[PDB]
Write a protein that binds this ligand. Structure first.
Ligand SMILES: Nc1nc2c(ncn2[C@@H]2O[C@@H]3COP(=O)(O)O[C@H]4[C@@H](O)[C@H](n5cnc6c(=O)[nH]c(N)nc65)O[C@@H]4COP(=O)(O)O[C@H]3[C@H]2O)c(=O)[nH]1
Lengths: 175, 176
């Protein structure tokens, strides 16, 4: 049970800090960029949660149907990215996406020597990380309204899963 | 061994990305701020490693003898690197780029868990392990390793002997 620690640290050390002042930075972004961040439910931080823990080494979104646009503006600095989402080769939405990056730590633990093992143990920990985070956010409702958790599991083969569809799905059911 | 995972993650997802570009941002900083970042061995990222894992909730340095001045500018991630002046007997004694190795906060949280996630002793061990693993990693990338220094210590939980500012100055003054 380190998913506990990971979630508390990711809340206390990051989410706790950025969520309160997200609307103001979003305001500044939309003043700067002529209201590019737009569409209902688009004024929120979408935190990607791949249970497979497939966060890229660079921690950024890398997907051919997801194109980076610009950053949110800014006592320290935050690196929140705004992407346009493609659907059938057309811009279908715009949103702020980022990976819940401590999932990377879980993938790393699954590669360790022989001890740090089991894809199954990692999956379970990721779920645990997720629900723990959700349980934390439940108690800070005003700030919880500033983000949404997109939980899924990317398969390791086949072509069925689409991260961009997954996001569009989540946005289109803002209920 | 979550220390192993934490370290590789801290390297791959953070250090690997900022260390090669630090000197350029340092150049930019010192064009802006008239060579404030100054003193031999001050052009480096000092990473604080408290084995106690006493990283503050807000992740910043919070010490009465360490005063924030300004941020490093950006080189596309955005990076948050703080430059502080160190005080010695009420007088500015040096300037440096300091930050906590923040994965250590994860270890503190694991030690507070329910009853299972336990042991100040198991956290100390993992912290050292995190540290030595990270050292092993940096050893392989010597050029970028030259851009940072690990400041490893253990802040006691009581008494007044420990001083983070003196710790830093000792590290800067005795850099050979
Ligand atoms: N991904 C990662 N980053 C690390 C790690 N250790 C230290 N950092 C860095 O600490 C820098 C400063 O913290 P921050 O300004 O408050 O702003 C930080 C900080 O609030 C946050 N952060 C702190 N701890 C964690 C954590 O345990 N997990 C995650 N996902 N984010 C964290 O990431 C924010 C933004 O990132 P940056 O601006 O680029 O720069 C951040 C962040 O990248 C690590 O193990 N993994």
């Amino acid at each position: 049970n380190v998913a506990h620690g990971l979630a508390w640290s990711y809340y206390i050390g990051y989410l706790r800090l950025i969520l309160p002042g997200l609307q103001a930075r979003i305001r500044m972004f939309n003043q700067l960029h002529n209201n590019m961040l737009s569409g209902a439910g688009s004024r929120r931080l979408y935190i990607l949660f791949p249970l497979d823990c497939g966060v890229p080494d660079n921690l950024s979104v890398v997907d051919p149907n997801i194109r980076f646009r610009d950053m949110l503006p800014q006592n320290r600095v935050y690196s929140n990215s705004v992407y346009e989402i493609l659907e059938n080769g057309q811009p279908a939405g715009v949103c702020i996406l980022e990976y819940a990056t401590p999932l990377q730590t879980l993938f790393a633990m699954s590669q360790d020597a022989k001890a740090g093992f089991s894809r199954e143990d990692r999956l379970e920990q990721a779920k645990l990380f997720c629900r723990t985070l959700e349980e934390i956010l439940e108690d800070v409702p005003e700030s919880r309204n500033n983000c949404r958790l997109i939980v899924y599991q990317e398969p390791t083969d086949g072509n069925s899963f689409s991260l961009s569809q997954e996001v569009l799905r989540h946005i289109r059911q803002e209920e």
